Amino acid sequence: NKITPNLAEFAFSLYRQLAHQSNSTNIFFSPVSIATAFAMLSLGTKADTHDEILEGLNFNLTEIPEAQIHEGFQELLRTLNLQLTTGNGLFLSEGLKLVDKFLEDVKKLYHSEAFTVNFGDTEEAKKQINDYVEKGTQGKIVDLVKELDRDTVFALVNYIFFKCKWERPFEVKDTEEEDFHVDQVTTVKVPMMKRLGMFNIQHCKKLSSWVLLMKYLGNATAIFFLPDEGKLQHLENELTHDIITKFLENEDRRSASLHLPKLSITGTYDLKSVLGQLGITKVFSNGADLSGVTEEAPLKLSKAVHKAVLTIDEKPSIPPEVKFNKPFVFLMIEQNTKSPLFMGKVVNPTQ
């Protein structure tokens, strides 16, 4: 896909930014869902506001036409509907003369929903937004938005929930509690899945990590990066889209004793500050050019929140014993487009 190299580097730049909030916190987000949410938002923006959004998503505006950018997200969204739940909620103040052109493209191209709410009642508007998140995933995510500004007129919520089955399941009788070294001294107890068999697992000398690829029931592939002792940040700095491609084409099977933790992690992020570090600020300020959304009315994106939820469960010489019992990076790749559906780091499964 013409945007997959751009999405992959946006994913890594976003991950590197979140990893600079230090080590001991579980990172998990969907680069596809965030990039799709703001590419869709760009349809209502113009001038510098429009350019910052696409530049912040790692699109060189002097090298790729915007029609290809929105076409790139067109096919990527055409693929996603796998056991994946995703949606975008645009919440605008009641009494705003919305531009019908933007509302049609939001549903037609990105399958996103726009709502009218009374932000003059901050507590109730927050409840209305969280109910859409709660109902949209059938209770999976509750009370997403925790605060709202007093001057809010426009809020964007992007959610994604993933709990899918492996193609090759683990046997539940094997799952047992093991040690998870969060660092060299702390340790914690975690339910660990285990299986002996042939895996697409290899040890990479460049990354200094074990790399495991496992295929999903659907168009998804999970890549697990288990770093060597003291090589976690080395893993984070040497990750490129090219290395992901070299692993997805490699088809070397090999036997191992895999210990993979059963875990359920969630990620919550305020995109206003996180995407501000990538240069997307004008849309969050009073000078925003949102004339594509409402024509004769000033508008700005007061609140933008992302929430991603994951659930991992079961569903001839001496083989190596590869145990994911210490902090490790992982990456979910959409099989068709080779785009990163999810990326994150697991420092503590219990959290």
User: How many Å separate Cα 156 from the centre of its chain?
Assistant: 16
**Cβ proximity of 320 and 256 under 8 Å:** yes
In angstroms, the Cα distances linking 284 to 50, 57, 124, 155, 288 are 12, 16, 22, 10, 7
Question: CA 248 → CA 87, 222, 224, 334, distances in Å?
Answer: 28, 10, 12, 11
Question: Domain 176-261+319-346 in CATH: superfamily?
Answer: Alpha-1-antitrypsin, domain 1 (2.30.39.10)
Q: Residue 341: which of 28, 20, 56 has the closest Cα?
A: 28
The boundaries of every CATH 3.30.497.10 domain in the chain are 4-163+265-311
Q: Phi, psi (5° rounding) for residue 160? A: -155, 135
Which of 255, 229, 246 has its CA nearest to residue 317? 255
The two beta strands, 154-162 and 321-323, are: unpaired
Beta strand ranges found along 78-237 (DSSP E): 84-93, 113-117, 154-162, 176-180, 188-204, 209-215, 220-227
Provide CATH code, domain 4-163+265-311. Answer: 3.30.497.10
Phi, psi angles (nearest 5°) of residue 220 = -140, 150
How was this model experimentally determined?
X-ray
Q: Report helix angle 241-249 to 4-19, nearest 10.
A: 120
96 exposure class (CB count in 10 Å sphere: 0-12, 13-18, 19+): middle
Tell the residue number behind the tokens 């190596």, with chain if given.
320
Cited resolution, angstroms? 2.4
Q: 3-state DSSP call for residue 188?
A: strand
Residue 159: how many other CB atoms lie within 10 Å? 25
End-to-end Cα separation, the chain, in angstroms: 36
User: CATH 2.30.39.10 region(s) of the chain?
Assistant: 176-261+319-346
| Residue 328: closest CA among 181, 221, 118 | 181
Three-state DSSP class for 56?
helix
CA atoms within 13 A on the CB side of 209: 27
